[PDB]
Enzyme design. Structure first.
Site, mmCIF file in Angstrom:
data_model
loop_
_atom_site.group_PDB
_atom_site.id
_atom_site.type_symbol
_atom_site.label_atom_id
_atom_site.label_comp_id
_atom_site.label_asym_id
_atom_site.label_seq_id
_atom_site.Cartn_x
_atom_site.Cartn_y
_atom_site.Cartn_z
ATOM 1 N N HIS E 151 0.657 -1.378 0.080
ATOM 2 C CA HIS E 151 0.053 0.154 -0.245
ATOM 3 C C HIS E 151 0.852 1.079 0.064
ATOM 4 C CE1 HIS E 151 -3.810 -1.711 0.614
ATOM 5 N NE2 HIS E 151 -3.351 -2.503 1.470
HETATM 6 ZN ZN LIG Z 1 -4.294 -6.286 2.993
#
Ligand SMILES: [Zn+2]
Lengths: 79, 25, 93, 116, 384
Positions: E151
């Site tokens: 992320h």
């Molecule tokens: Zn995740």
């Protein structure tokens, strides 16, 4: 916050039963503290009595018993 | 149009027998 | 623990059997309901029936109850015990 | 240069994260003076009152169950105490050429009552 | 007519697909903790590793401690200012960096713990050394559970991820491989990795993620890449509670079509444990067999792969599935009876390897997945 559960209209209802025609707005929050400290006196003694019977539950009998101590007897709930 | 030795059987019912049969199923 | 949560639908077996029992109880003890099952008894016990018997059985069932009620055609086939249920609510009227 | 922090958030977008007839003032009031004076039912909704007792008794002893009649005894006693105190306050007010109970009117009553 | 409802076949290894497995573990990774109330725990790495050692899996593989990444090497993808902030911020001097706290999204949902720079260095070094060992031919499978931070982006930290080590690993793979396929079986969308390689055809980023109002919100099916990277970013949106058979019948055709159409030279597999059932943040219904079937299926293609472990916020389940996946890469199936480790008290009540799926609704209907895979297959026709 459970104290704020004693709501305004309820304090107004107590004043009405008490014959008050205009309640200040600052009364409502004074009546809470006074209420609390008083309950906090009975319930205290209610429990001293409770932990003398080695009972863990409190009874209405112990409640009117604590009232008798404080001075304000309550008829209608035993004793 | 006689259907001898029939194998398909029809039950016509209101809501009561239908709900009873639905609970059974 | 036994079924690895695959038997969750059996958690209310007592309540569903109680509801089935209650539905059977009001199934025999209701007016315009037990005679429908009596007509089912006469239709099932007396085999070798043509089509015209099936329509007159249908309107005789219809005449027992109200004109706004719902009919259900629960078809059973001996071979395969396959119960097809059909919704003919206010359709044959 | 005085500074203060109010966002209280080290980072923004915290949500996107992975973790007509009308009576004159007082006539209705006197009408429901009469209503709550002719009546005897209990004016502080119960549940709320019961709770007041649980959170406040907790201090004196944990796990203290209360017989139902008890929280009803606490209610009765509390409503009796407050209606007596409010009669006195109305007096402590009608004393000072007025018709509106005010906080001061009850800090006094309690002083003369001696409950302070 | 693309999706086929197929029951989950048992996991079987291929004896003709023996791979030299390199394991990257730094004993320190676990001694780092995001916070007191935080779901992400690097401690899941070493209970996964304790299951590797106590299963006797170290005799079929080589254990390496990768050199931690320096400041510049992190700047192969991230900016200088973001790495400079990451290497200098501590919970002590958090008030000295307030503009950078909201600039780089560090402080809330990505808290500052005092081993942040070292944790990121361990993760990035593990990913880059796994890719480097894949480049030189020293190993066929590189296993690094220290990373998986998919992320993290160029100048921000999101989703409990600070250093996008997967981008660094794919960068190190691209120096020797022309086409690198990134597969993300994490329940969240690999937004950092997909965003990094959005405009290039050299990296195909495939993500099998839940797409609802779920983090990070990116990952619509229409996101297929722009520029030269058009139709080179496959997004597979899934609903809640996907089971092993459904996930297999979605994963295997898509990855197979990518294999025979994109034809990659290296594979990066994000093994997020939050795709498992019973996860704190995940919403899928995968058992450990269902999670490991993706790793076993991608192992069958013979492409030199880098198995990198990502999410997973219940430590026991992610540790067990990582141990099973690691054992699967050595062409063995570990028995469902856990050996005695120092963290044996986590895996109650049965103390077995298996992660049991929940009995919740598989709301991924066959028609929806058929349409999803039909549009995905149609977009993949231009990747030859
Ligand atoms: Zn995740």
């Amino acid at each position: 916050d459970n104290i704020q559960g004693i709501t305004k209209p309820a304090i107004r209802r107590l004043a009405r039963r008490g014959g008050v025609k205009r309640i200040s707005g600052l009364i409502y929050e004074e009546t809470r503290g006074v209420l609390k400290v008083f309950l906090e006196n009975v319930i205290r003694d209610a429990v001293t009595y409770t932990e003398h019977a080695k009972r863990k539950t409190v009874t209405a009998m112990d409640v009117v018993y604590a009232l008798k101590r404080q001075g304000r007897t309550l008829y209608g709930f035993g004793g | 149009g006689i259907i001898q030795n029939r194998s398909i059987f029809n039950l016509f019912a209101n809501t009561n027998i239908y709900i009873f049969f639905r609970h059974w199923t | 623990q036994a079924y690895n949560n695959k038997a969750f639908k059996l958690y209310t077996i007592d309540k569903v059997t109680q509801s089935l029992v209650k539905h059977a109880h009001t199934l025999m003890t209701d007016a315009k309901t037990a005679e429908i099952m009596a007509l089912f008894v006469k239709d099932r016990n007396a085999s070798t029936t043509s089509a015209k018997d099936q329509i007159i059985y249908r309107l005789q069932v219809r005449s027992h109850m109200s004109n706004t009620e719902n009919m259900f055609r629960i078809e059973f086939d001996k071979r395969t015990l396959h119960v097809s249920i059909q919704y003919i609510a206010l359709d044959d009227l | 240069a005085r500074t203060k922090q109010t966002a209280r958030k080290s980072t923004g977008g915290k949500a996107p994260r992975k973790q007509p007839h009308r009576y004159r003032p007082g006539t209705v009031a006197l009408r429901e003076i009469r209503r709550y004076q002719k009546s005897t039912e209990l004016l502080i909704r119960k549940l709320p009152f019961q709770r007041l007792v649980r959170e406040i008794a907790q201090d004196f002893k944990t796990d203290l169950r209360f017989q139902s009649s008890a929280v009803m005894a606490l209610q009765e006693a509390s409503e009796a105490y407050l209606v007596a105190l409010f009669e006195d306050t109305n007096l402590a007010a009608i004393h000072a050429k007025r018709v509106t109970i005010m906080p001061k009117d009850i800090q006094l009553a309690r002083r003369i009552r001696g409950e302070r | 007519m693309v999706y086929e409802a197929t029951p989950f076949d048992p996991i079987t290894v291929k004896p003709s697909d023996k791979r030299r497995v390199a394991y990257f573990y730094d004993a320190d990774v676990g001694n780092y903790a995001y916070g007191a109330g935080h779901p992400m725990k690097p401690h899941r790495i070493r209970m996964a590793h304790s299951l590797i050692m106590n299963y006797g899996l170290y005799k079929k593989m080589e254990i390496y401690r990768a050199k931690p990444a320096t400041k510049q090497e992190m700047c192969q993808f991230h900016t200088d200012e973001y790495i400079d902030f990451l290497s200098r911020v501590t919970p002590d001097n958090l008030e000295m960096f307030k503009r950078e706290s909201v600039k780089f999204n560090v402080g809330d949902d990505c808290p500052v713990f005092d081993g942040l720079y070292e944790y990121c260095s361990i993760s990035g070094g593990g990913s880059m050394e796994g890719a480097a060992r894949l480049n030189r031919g020293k190993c066929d499978v590189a296993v690094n559970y220290a990373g998986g931070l998919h992320h993290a982006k160029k100048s921000e930290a999101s989703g409990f991820c600070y250093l996008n080590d997967i981008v660094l690993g794919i960068i190190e793979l691209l120096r020797y491989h022309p086409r690198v396929l990134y597969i993300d079986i994490d329940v969240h969308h690999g937004d950092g990795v997909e965003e990094a390689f959005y405009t290039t055809d050299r990296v195909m980023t495939c993500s099998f993620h839940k797409y609802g109002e779920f983090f990070p919100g990116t990952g619509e099916l229409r996101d297929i890449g722009v520029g030269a990277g058009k139709n080179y970013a496959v997004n597979v949106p899934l609903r809640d509670g996907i089971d092993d058979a459904t996930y297999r019948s979605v994963f295997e055709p898509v990855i197979k079509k990518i294999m025979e159409w994109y034809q990659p030279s290296a594979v990066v597999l994000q093994c997020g444990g939050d795709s498992l059932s019973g996860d704190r943040l995940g919403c899928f219904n995968l058992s450990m067999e269902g999670h490991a079937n993706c790793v076993n299926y991608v192992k069958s293609f013979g492409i030199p792969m880098m198995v990198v472990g990502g999410g997973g916020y219940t430590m026991r389940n992610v540790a067990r599935t990582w141990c099973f996946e690691t054992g699967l890469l050595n062409n063995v199936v570990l028995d469902k009876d856990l050996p005695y480790n120092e963290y044996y008290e986590y895996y109650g009540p049965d103390y077995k390897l298996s992660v049991r799926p929940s009995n919740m609704f598989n709301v991924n209907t066959p028609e929806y997945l058929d349409k999803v895979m039909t549009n995905i297959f149609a977009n993949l026709e231009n990747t030859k």
